[PDB]
Design an enzyme around this catalytic site. Structure first.
Site, PDB file in Angstrom:
ATOM      1  N   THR A  13       0.894  -1.191   0.000  1.00  0.00           N
ATOM      2  CA  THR A  13       0.000   0.000   0.000  1.00  0.00           C
ATOM      3  C   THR A  13       0.911   1.214   0.000  1.00  0.00           C
ATOM      4  O   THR A  13       1.905   1.283   0.721  1.00  0.00           O
ATOM      5  CB  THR A  13      -1.029  -0.033   1.153  1.00  0.00           C
ATOM      6  OG1 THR A  13      -2.003  -1.051   0.878  1.00  0.00           O
ATOM      7  CG2 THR A  13      -1.756   1.313   1.323  1.00  0.00           C
ATOM      8  N   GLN A  14       0.523   2.176  -0.816  1.00  0.00           N
ATOM      9  CA  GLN A  14       1.457   2.938  -1.609  1.00  0.00           C
ATOM     10  C   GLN A  14       0.702   4.181  -2.028  1.00  0.00           C
ATOM     11  O   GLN A  14      -0.529   4.186  -2.054  1.00  0.00           O
ATOM     12  CB  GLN A  14       1.809   2.139  -2.878  1.00  0.00           C
ATOM     13  CG  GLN A  14       3.045   1.251  -2.812  1.00  0.00           C
ATOM     14  CD  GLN A  14       4.063   1.529  -3.919  1.00  0.00           C
ATOM     15  OE1 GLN A  14       4.043   2.580  -4.568  1.00  0.00           O
ATOM     16  NE2 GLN A  14       4.967   0.579  -4.130  1.00  0.00           N
ATOM     17  N   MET A  55      -0.490  -6.980  -2.036  1.00  0.00           N
ATOM     18  CA  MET A  55      -0.951  -5.659  -1.587  1.00  0.00           C
ATOM     19  C   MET A  55       0.151  -4.595  -1.579  1.00  0.00           C
ATOM     20  O   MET A  55       0.108  -3.645  -0.794  1.00  0.00           O
ATOM     21  CB  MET A  55      -1.617  -5.766  -0.208  1.00  0.00           C
ATOM     22  CG  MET A  55      -2.865  -6.631  -0.207  1.00  0.00           C
ATOM     23  SD  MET A  55      -4.189  -5.898  -1.189  1.00  0.00           S
ATOM     24  CE  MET A  55      -4.701  -4.555  -0.116  1.00  0.00           C
ATOM     25  N   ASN A  56       1.123  -4.754  -2.474  1.00  0.00           N
ATOM     26  CA  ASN A  56       2.230  -3.816  -2.608  1.00  0.00           C
ATOM     27  C   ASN A  56       2.529  -3.599  -4.088  1.00  0.00           C
ATOM     28  O   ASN A  56       3.538  -4.080  -4.598  1.00  0.00           O
ATOM     29  CB  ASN A  56       3.463  -4.343  -1.864  1.00  0.00           C
ATOM     30  CG  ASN A  56       4.674  -3.413  -1.959  1.00  0.00           C
ATOM     31  OD1 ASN A  56       5.812  -3.881  -1.960  1.00  0.00           O
ATOM     32  ND2 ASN A  56       4.440  -2.102  -2.028  1.00  0.00           N
ATOM     33  N   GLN A 112      -6.375   4.645  -0.295  1.00  0.00           N
ATOM     34  CA  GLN A 112      -5.875   3.266  -0.005  1.00  0.00           C
ATOM     35  C   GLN A 112      -5.938   2.441  -1.291  1.00  0.00           C
ATOM     36  O   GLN A 112      -6.846   2.622  -2.105  1.00  0.00           O
ATOM     37  CB  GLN A 112      -6.709   2.607   1.111  1.00  0.00           C
ATOM     38  CG  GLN A 112      -5.937   1.710   2.080  1.00  0.00           C
ATOM     39  CD  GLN A 112      -6.120   0.221   1.818  1.00  0.00           C
ATOM     40  OE1 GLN A 112      -6.975  -0.422   2.428  1.00  0.00           O
ATOM     41  NE2 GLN A 112      -5.311  -0.334   0.920  1.00  0.00           N
TER      42      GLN A 112
END
Ligand SMILES: COc1ccc(C[C@H](NC(=O)[C@H](C)NC(=O)CN2CCOCC2)C(=O)N[C@@H](CC2CCCCC2)C(=O)[C@H](C)CO)cc1
Ligand SMILES: [Mg+2]
Lengths: 244, 231, 250, 233, 240, 212, 222, 235
Positions: free
Chosen positions: D1-2, D107-108, G1
């Protein structure tokens, strides 16, 4: 690889004994004799130190007799340092039990766990066994006064009177000859000292070559007291039974 | 002698005896042959049976649509190595959408076998493999040995008495290398090559095993009635 | 790669001896003599600084080491083994005691920890025993002054006075004659210096002898003032000059 | 998450009869700040593939290093590395798509939208898109960002289905691409005047043009526009 | 972790560490189990060069695994504790997940599996122990007796014995136990069990232990006299 | 969903509807909600469709392994406990299951266990489970007697699910019926509510809320 | 998000006949209000006479199809080239989907082919691997438009025999491949009329004992 | 000593070869494949008459369509059976079908060379794995601790095996009925067994498509023994 240098400490002989256990017992057989005698009103622990020098500090010393908790003590025959490892384990085990159940640990339960630790070193891990035999003396409210021994095999048994270390053969015969079930602590004290007196490899048994302890019902009503004897107290009790 | 206890020990002349002993299981293996033209590549393998009541042990394993191999030696070791190849071919497909070059398959096998010749406790693989395939630079034949040595050839053979077939293929080189555009003629030459290694016995219908891969032909294996055409 | 030596290298022989421990003790025998003497108001530990070449600067090699401000150690046997034991002993005094109780451990308990480390090198996989015997002298509030010997097995004993290494049989005999329970520290230093002359071959001065005491608190060695209850280290290394002053009146 | 910091805007592209064209401007924005002005967002791989990247520039630079390490790796023990075993555009794409989907699945993500343009070894045109979600798709025209909204409609007037590709020349296609770049400069607040353009042709190979400019702009009609409704002067 | 393959094959196809574990069993005090029509009895010799023993507290030779099953053994005493504990844990775990106490066969199969595992895992030697496991399955009246040995093989027995001089007492039971007619009572079964131990033991003093197991978790140890009554009485039937 | 099972004089009745939902979207009218684990064991399904299917067919595999290892069919108690111990491990992860494990062994007699994804396990004679449970309960409870004939018990079970299928928006399709005895489970057919409602209305004279 | 999911639109449809089955899907691919492609196939031949579509989030759909195709390949390797039957494919796919129960593939999956008696088979799945065999199923964006039409025209629901006083149902019967293709094409043009994410192209895969055939039809491009 | 994974100079694995010797010492097991079924029979070999022979379990179910008999260090087989049963049930869970006999056998054989310095030594037991599947019909496999498995029309393993196998070489033909195979197994077992074959010290089993894997009761096998002596007498 490294297999070349592995002695394989945990294998059976063709006869089905455990080499390292047997050889550990051989080592223990040259250690200072320790005797435990159980009476109806208490227990004696008596043990002979390894050939002293006049310069050894006798009163701040401890080699044979250790306190596990307030109700349980051991006499050691074998490697002292090996024994300290097991003693600290046993002390911690006792406190875990007290912490869990809010009751002092029953003597056998403590004895069994130490014996299980010894047993493990004979079956897995490829390490040498502990070169130690213990005499356990203790009290609990299930069996009262109790004596046990354990040796490097992790086998344990209960006794009325027993010796470990050097000359247990002679010592056991002498104990068998004079022991009686209705005996008191003060008679047992005398029996222990006379037995060491006759089996010792020294010329005469003096205060400075001994350690001595009792576990009595000997304070105020129903509660148990451990007395590790100071040197002067051993000197007196040696005269009081007429060995000096 | 004193130096053959494990793979991690050199002899005084610089030999690795455990590897040499693994090589020996190949030599007791039933014979198999590989050869190729510019358009196809073929495997022929003589299968061995336990006795008259038994099956004839498979010696040919498909690795991908365009690649497969034959074995001589310990079969479980071929299953381990072929399974690794199946995975490597498969990874090339899923990740790069690219059919694995037979040459890389060779380098990957050499490296896999090598590890087991330099570390304690493991053993070398006890099997030799002949790998055929058709990729972006045409037909290929590879010889794998558990020393880790992999070699690209026009033709070869491994197993007991493979020396006959290998001499035959050495003589026949100029003939078979140009059997282009003709499946059944490359096979027949392969079946001929393998015949130079038979004794007391000849090729039957439950005894012979053939595989082919090439320009417009998936790696496919023939056994049973489908090899009768060739005896 | 990695350690595949997870089995013991010290084991029981059929006669019951632990060979590697016996052999470690033999290395201790060959070692240079060291000793310790307990007085009523102090302890002294001493040894010979036997130098390897005269080009070596033997003040850069300390055989007598501070462990805590009230505890010192000396050894006989293999110097490198001793050096790492000192490193570990210093650290365990903190990790297993000072970081918990806010004070340095009493002598017997620190000795207990060192002994544990040495016992483990006697049973754990893939190691040999330490090839040294230690003499540890110290002071603590509730036990007063004490002196301990630690051997390769991990066994330790309290002594009034003793010696280890090369000429230890002769030196133990010498100390038996001269020791009494009334010795004042200065007397024990003098006896230590006499005993050590017996075992020393060459030069015998304050540059070839290493000697330290556990005695009075040294406020001047503390490095700060203003905390009344911090009075200074009881461990003090005698200087080259201090040793020679005592060698003339010998 | 970024979250993307330094970003590049649209990448546009189309097939024509003998190849593919792809273009992207030379700006690295930092939010609304037009921070960096000489940023190359078309990255050639061999002589047959250009990878065009929008979105986070730190991740773009990571992807460059992946691609240049891929070339190195492919040359290893490969005597046909500059011939039959050279990297195809489709190989390069599948690798990037694999990576993008794995990174989103952990999730990256790599915060990018990517178009891989080139010609396969059999002469076929290659044009495929992949983004930070690992979504992939192919079309006669492809664009990212504002490009999808404003370029695609213009480029689709030229090539609206598969059968329009043989009918489209490199002169027609490049013209349509260059015009789309002007439109994006009029209308996208994070575009720049300067851009790079690359053609990958089955006959002429890879042509890579740097320092192009949006030219022939209509601004004159601005002088007549006064106020916001009723104001005359 | 310590890894050595200690139990391995020799050229003749024997695993010497398993076979030497049997030697340790042979050196152990004798143990016998005999099943009746409606009970099982377990008897155990205890060697007598040990006087001054405290009998209140020395571990007894028959261990309850659950309230309905018992286990006895010959061999290394320390080794046996490990098996008994594991067996005891498994018995409670079975009650927890299945909501039923173990069958005697099941418990035997578990202990046997443990023993086998120690013959082909790195870094460990086999158990120097053979066991007799006896009891009654929940809500069943058919008696059950099984034997396990260091290899991990197990089996059911009408009657069986292990330990030193068990070849002598197996001999006895083989000619004295009638399959067709098993000791139809407790009294009869205990007697036969004590008779077989007397072939090997000495004086039936503090030398024989007996435990009787009946259905529905009815397990009781005899004390000296109750045994001594069998000793006296058989010796009197003998002068014939 | 609506599911039920009850014990009586003649063994066990088990009845279920056959609707699957995705919110207010009717995903299916023909879905199987009973799993035949073995000839003496049934499992009913309510909650997450995948959770129910996946873990109940997994339960069947575990029951099959029990009989291979123990040479004996698993108890209803033990089979239900395999499932409840499984879902207890996942407690908090968001599994959604309401199940009844229904069967006969000789050591137990006919037995029903309620098991849900909270880890609740209950032995009992009557349960209804699912979004329509209350509707089924209202009919089932108010006509239940221990002594129902097999024929009447089957009907009540069928009629109870019909009641729930009618009033509960998230139940419907058809009724699937089972009877469990000492000789195992017996299927008693698929009964589409399309026809069954009208047939029951006519013959019974109930459902007077409905425009006839 | 960061949101790991998207929605690529489109819709799919499967019908089974007596000795065949079809699996159809539009060829449009979208995000938000944009068209990514007018021709991006989402129905695939997976080998062993099985066709598959996983419609919803395309990245998840592609990953699933790839994993299943790979599953078929390893089934051959591991079980002596045995044919993977449609029932076995479906159960395998359940495990692929349920393995990501707590981080789902956002797709509605349909597979079609022939059962082991040669009869047409359609299986359909929810996102976490719930499944059922039917004659009939639509999935994806326009599923709610198309499915009830299929209930009426494939399974004759709510249709009675005229003059029987609504007492005798129109009797069930298999449909010819020609009648099925008519229902497919009408289904998709109807869906294209009312759903913005459906259009551009229709690609049908037909499965019989002779293998897999394709047909393609244009759909409205607005 | 020497590592557990060492090759001999002849290119064989010492430990595997030695386990093969242990199997030769094992009790006899025989299997015969027909077009009507596969029979599996074994010699129980009780070490003493007090041991209750029905507790000897050398024939074992793996699934309804797969059975197994063993010979050698039979305690080693518990974990192989357990693995076999799990692989079979697991396959049915993943694929909603029966697992092929060859596939099952390959899976069991995958365990075999997983030993070294993973378990400490090879298995000291050989297995006959017998079953039916729709693709290849009735099948019999011999699984060894080398990881090799072989399909057989008939096969003997254990102590009487070299004798028994020669006998099976002569007696097996492609048209044996199940009943002919049952008798043949009984007959060859009585030949190589030490003690006199009866229904208590040998055991039969078969697997048929129709009824799956069944172990025969002692009453049923007693009759087949009776029927076998009557056949031998009558010529
Ligand atoms: C955890 O969240 C839930 C819980 C319960 C439901 C109702 C259930 N429907 C479904 O499972 C539908 C087909 N699929 C989904 O809702 C999709 N997934 C839900 C789980 O998270 C990922 C997305 C359904 O239809 N249940 C039936 C019983 C089933 C029918 C299918 C066979 C097994 C039993 C029943 O309980 C009634 C209709 C109420 O749902 C939905 C979501
Ligand atoms: Mg539309």
């Amino acid at each position: 690889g490294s297999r070349r240098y592995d002695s394989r400490t945990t294998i059976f002989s063709p006869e089905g004994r455990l080499y390292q256990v047997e050889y550990a017992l051989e080592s223990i057989s040259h250690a200072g004799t320790a005797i435990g005698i159980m009476a109806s009103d208490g227990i004696v622990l008596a043990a002979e130190r390894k050939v002293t020098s006049t310069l050894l500090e006798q009163d701040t010393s401890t080699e044979k007799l250790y306190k596990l908790n307030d109700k349980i003590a051991v006499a050691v025959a074998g490697l002292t340092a090996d024994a300290e490892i097991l003693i600290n384990t046993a002390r911690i085990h006792a406190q875990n039990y007290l912490k869990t159940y809010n009751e002092d640990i029953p003597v056998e339960i403590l004895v069994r766990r130490l014996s299980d630790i010894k047993q493990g070193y004979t079956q897995h891990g490829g390490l040498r066994p502990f070169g130690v035999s213990f005499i356990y003396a203790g009290y609990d409210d299930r069996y009262g006064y109790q004596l046990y021994t354990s040796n490097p095999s992790g086998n344990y048994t209960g006794w009325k009177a027993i010796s470990v270390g050097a000359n247990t053969s002679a010592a056991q015969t002498l104990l068998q000859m004079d022991y009686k079930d209705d005996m008191k602590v003060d008679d047992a004290i005398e029996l222990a000292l006379k037995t060491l007196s006759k089996t010792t490899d020294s010329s005469a048994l003096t205060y400075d070559r001994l350690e001595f302890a009792t576990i009595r019902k000997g304070a105020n009503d129903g509660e148990v007291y451990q007395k590790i004897f100071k040197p002067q107290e051993i000197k007196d009790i040696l005269v009081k039974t007429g060995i000096t | 002698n004193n130096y053959d206890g494990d793979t991690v020990t050199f002899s005084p002349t610089g030999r690795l005896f455990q590897v040499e002993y693994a090589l020996e299981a190949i030599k007791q293996g039933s014979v198999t042959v590989g050869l190729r033209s510019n358009t196809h590549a073929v495997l022929v393998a003589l299968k061995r049976n336990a006795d008259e009541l038994s099956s004839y042990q498979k010696k040919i394993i498909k690795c991908d649509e365009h690649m497969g191999l034959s074995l001589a030696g310990l079969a479980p070791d071929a299953r381990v190595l072929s399974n690794y190849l199946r995975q490597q071919c498969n990874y090339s497909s899923l990740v790069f959408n690219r059919k694995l070059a037979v040459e890389r398959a060779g380098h990957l096998l050499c490296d896999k076998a090598q590890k087991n010749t330099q570390s304690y406790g493991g053993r070398p693989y006890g099997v030799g493999l002949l790998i055929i395939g058709y990729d972006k630079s045409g037909a290929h034949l590879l010889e794998f040995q558990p020393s880790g040595n992999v070699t690209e050839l026009y033709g070869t053979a491994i197993g007991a008495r493979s020396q006959g077939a290998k001499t035959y293929l050495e003589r026949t080189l100029d003939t078979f290398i140009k059997i282009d555009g003709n499946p059944d003629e490359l096979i027949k030459a392969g079946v001929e090559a393998i015949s130079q290694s038979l004794r007391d016995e000849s090729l039957t219908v439950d005894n012979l095993s053939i595989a082919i891969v090439g320009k417009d032909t998936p790696f496919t294996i023939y056994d049973g009635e489908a090899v009768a055409k060739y005896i | 790669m990695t350690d595949r030596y997870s089995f013991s290298l010290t084991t029981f022989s059929p006669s019951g001896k632990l060979g590697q421990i016996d052999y470690a003790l033999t290395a201790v025998k060959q070692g240079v003599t060291s000793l310790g003497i307990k007085a009523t108001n102090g302890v002294v530990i001493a040894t010979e600084k036997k130098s390897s070449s005269p080009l070596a600067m033997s003040e850069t090699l300390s055989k007598v080491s501070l462990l805590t401000p009230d505890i010192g150690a000396v050894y006989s046997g293999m110097g490198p083994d001793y050096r790492v034991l000192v490193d570990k002993s210093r650290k365990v005094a903190h990790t297993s005691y000072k970081r918990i109780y806010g004070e340095y451990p009493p002598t017997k308990l620190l000795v207990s920890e060192v002994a544990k480390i040495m016992q483990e090198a006697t049973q754990s996989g893939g190691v040999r025993p330490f090839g040294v015997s230690l003499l540890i002298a110290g002071h603590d509030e509730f036990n007063g002054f004490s002196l301990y010997q630690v051997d390769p097995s991990g066994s330790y004993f309290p002594w009034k006075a003793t010696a280890i290494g090369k000429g230890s049989v002769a030196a133990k005999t010498f100390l038996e004659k001269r020791w009494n329970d009334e010795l004042e520290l200065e007397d024990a230093i003098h006896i230590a210096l006499l005993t050590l002359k017996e075992s020393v071959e060459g030069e015998f001065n304050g540059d070839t002898i290493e000697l330290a005491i556990i005695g009075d608190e040294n406020p001047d060695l503390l490095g700060y003032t203003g905390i009344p209850t911090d009075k200074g280290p009881r461990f003090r290394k005698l200087t080259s000059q201090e040793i020679n002053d005592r060698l003339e009146a010998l | 998450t970024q979250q993307p910091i330094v970003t590049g805007t649209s990448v546009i592209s189309m097939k024509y009869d003998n190849g593919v064209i792809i273009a992207a401007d030379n700006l690295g924005s930092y939010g609304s700040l037009l921070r960096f002005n000489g940023v190359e967002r078309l990255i050639p791989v061999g002589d047959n593939t250009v990878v065009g990247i929008s979105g986070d520039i730190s991740d773009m630079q990571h992807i460059e290093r992946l691609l240049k390490d891929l070339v190195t790796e492919n040359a290893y023990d490969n005597p046909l590395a500059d011939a039959e075993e050279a990297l195809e555009p489709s190989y390069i794409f599948e690798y990037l798509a694999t990576v993008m989907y794995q990174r989103r699945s952990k999730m990256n993500p790599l915060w990018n939208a990517i178009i891989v343009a080139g010609v396969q070894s059999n002469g076929d045109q290659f044009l495929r898109y992949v983004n930070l979600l690992g979504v992939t798709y192919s079309s006669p025209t492809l664009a990212t960002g504002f490009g999808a909204h404003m370029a695609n409609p213009l480029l689709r007037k030229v090539v609206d289905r598969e059968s329009d590709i043989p009918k489209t020349t490199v002169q027609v296609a490049e013209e349509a691409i260059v015009n789309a770049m002007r439109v994006l400069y009029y209308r996208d607040a994070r575009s720049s005047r300067n851009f790079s353009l690359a053609i990958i042709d089955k006959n002429t190979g890879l042509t890579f043009k740097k320092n192009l400019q949006v030219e022939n702009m209509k601004w004159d009609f601005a002088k007549d526009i006064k106020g916001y409704g009723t104001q005359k002067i | 972790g310590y890894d050595r393959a200690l139990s391995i094959f020799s050229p003749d196809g024997h695993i010497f560490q398993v076979e030497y574990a049997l030697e340790a069993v042979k050196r152990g005090t004798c143990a016998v189990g005999v099943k009746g029509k409606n009970c099982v009895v377990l008897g155990c010799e205890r060697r007598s060069t040990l006087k001054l023993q405290d009998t209140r507290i020395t571990p007894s030779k028959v261990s309850k695994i659950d309230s309905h099953v018992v286990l006895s053994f010959s061999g290394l005493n320390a080794d046996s504790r490990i098996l008994i504990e594991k067996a005891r844990v498994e018995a409670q775990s079975h009650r927890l997940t299945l909501e039923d106490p173990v069958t005697v066969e099941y418990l035997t199969r578990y202990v046997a599996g443990v023993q086998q595992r120690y013959t082909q895992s790195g870094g460990v030697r086999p158990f120097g122990v053979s066991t007799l496991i006896a009891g009654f399955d929940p809500r069943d009246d058919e008696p059950k007796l099984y034997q396990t040995e260091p290899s991990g093989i197990y089996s059911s027995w009408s009657a069986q014995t292990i330990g030193r001089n068990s070849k002598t007492v197996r001999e006895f039971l083989e000619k004295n136990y009638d399959r067709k007619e098993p000791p139809a009572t407790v009294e009869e079964c205990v007697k036969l069990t004590v008779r077989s131990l007397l072939e090997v033991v000495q004086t039936g003093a503090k030398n024989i232990e007996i435990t009787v197991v009946k259905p529905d978790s009815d397990i009781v140890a005899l004390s000296s006299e109750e045994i001594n009554q069998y000793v006296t009485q058989i010796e009197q039937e003998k002068q014939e | 969903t609506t599911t039920l099972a009850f014990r009586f004089q003649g063994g066990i009745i088990v009845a279920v509807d056959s609707r699957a939902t995705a919110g207010n979207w009717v995903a299916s009218q023909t879905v199987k909600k009973v799993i035949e684990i073995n000839p003496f064991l049934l499992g009913t399904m309510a909650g997450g469709a995948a959770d129910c299917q996946f873990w109940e067919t997994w339960l069947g595999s575990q029951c099959r392994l029990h009989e291979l290892r123990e040479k004996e069919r698993i108890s209803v108690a033990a089979a239900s406990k395999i499932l409840s111990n499984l879902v207890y491990q996942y407690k908090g992860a968001g599994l959604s299951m309401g199940t009844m494990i229904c069967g006969y062994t000789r050591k137990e007699g006919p037995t029903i266990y309620y098991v849900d994804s909270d880890g609740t396990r209950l032995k009992g004679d009557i349960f209804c489970v699912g979004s329509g449970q209350t509707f089924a309960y209202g009919v089932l409870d108010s006509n239940y007697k221990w002594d129902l004939s097999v024929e009447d018990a089957l009907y009540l079970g069928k009629r109870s699910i019909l009641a729930a299928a009618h009033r509960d928006a998230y139940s419907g399709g058809s009724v699937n019926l089972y009877h469990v005895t000492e000789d195992g489970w017996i299927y008693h057919g698929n009964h589409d509510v399309g026809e069954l409602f009208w047939k029951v209305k006519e013959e019974e004279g109930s459902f007077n809320n409905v425009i006839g | 998000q960061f949101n790991p999911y998207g929605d690529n639109g489109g819709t799919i449809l499967g019908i089974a006949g007596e000795d065949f089955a079809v699996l159809a899907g539009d060829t449009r691919n979208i995000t938000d209000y944009s068209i990514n492609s007018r021709y991006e196939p989402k129905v695939f031949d997976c080998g062993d006479n099985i066709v598959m579509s996983a419609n919803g989030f395309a990245a998840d759909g592609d990953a699933l199809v790839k994993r299943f195709k790979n599953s078929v390949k390893w089934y051959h390797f591991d079980h002596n080239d045995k044919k993977l039957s449609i029932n076995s494919a479906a159960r395998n796919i359940q495990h692929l989907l349920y393995g990501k129960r707590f981080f789902p593939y956002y797709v509605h999956t349909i597979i079609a082919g022939l059962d082991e008696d040669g009869k047409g088979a359609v299986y359909s799945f929810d996102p976490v691997g719930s499944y059922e065999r039917e004659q009939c199923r639509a999935g994806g964006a326009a599923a709610s438009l198309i499915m009830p039409f299929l209930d009426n025209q494939v399974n004759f629901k709510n249709q009675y025999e005229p003059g029987t006083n609504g007492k005798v149902k129109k009797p069930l019967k298999y449909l010819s491949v020609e009648e099925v293709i008519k229902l497919v094409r009408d289904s998709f043009t109807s869906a294209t009329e009312r759903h913005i994410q459906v259009g551009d192209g229709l690609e049908i895969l037909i499965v019989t004992k002779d293998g897999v055939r394709k047909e393609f039809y244009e759909l409205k491009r607005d | 000593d020497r590592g557990v994974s060492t090759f001999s100079p002849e290119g064989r694995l010492f430990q595997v070869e030695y386990s093969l010797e242990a199997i030769k010492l094992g009790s006899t097991a025989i299997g015969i494949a027909t077009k009507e079924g596969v029979v599996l029979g074994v010699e129980k070999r009780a070490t003493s008459p007090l041991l209750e022979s029905d507790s000897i379990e050398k024939i074992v179910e793996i699934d309804r369509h797969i059975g197994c008999a063993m010979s050698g260090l039979t305690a080693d087989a518990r974990s192989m059976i357990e693995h076999a049963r799990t692989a079979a049930v697991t396959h049915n869970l993943y694929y909603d079908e029966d697992i092929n006999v060859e596939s099952l056998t390959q899976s069991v054989c995958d365990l075999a060379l997983r030993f070294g310095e993973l378990m400490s030594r090879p298995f000291g037991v050989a297995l006959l794995i017998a079953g039916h599947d729709a693709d290849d019909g009735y099948q019999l496999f011999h699984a060894e601790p080398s990881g090799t498995f072989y399909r057989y029309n008939a096969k003997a393993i254990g102590s009487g095996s070299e004798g028994a196998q020669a006998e099976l070489l002569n007696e097996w033909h492609s048209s044996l009925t199940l009943k002919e195979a049952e008798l043949l197994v009984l007959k060859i077992l009585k030949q190589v067994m030490e003690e006199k074959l009866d229904e208590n010290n040998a055991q039969l089993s078969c697997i048929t498509k129709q009824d799956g894997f069944k172990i025969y009761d002692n009453e049923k096998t007693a009759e087949l023994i009776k029927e076998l002596k009557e056949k031998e007498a009558a010529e």
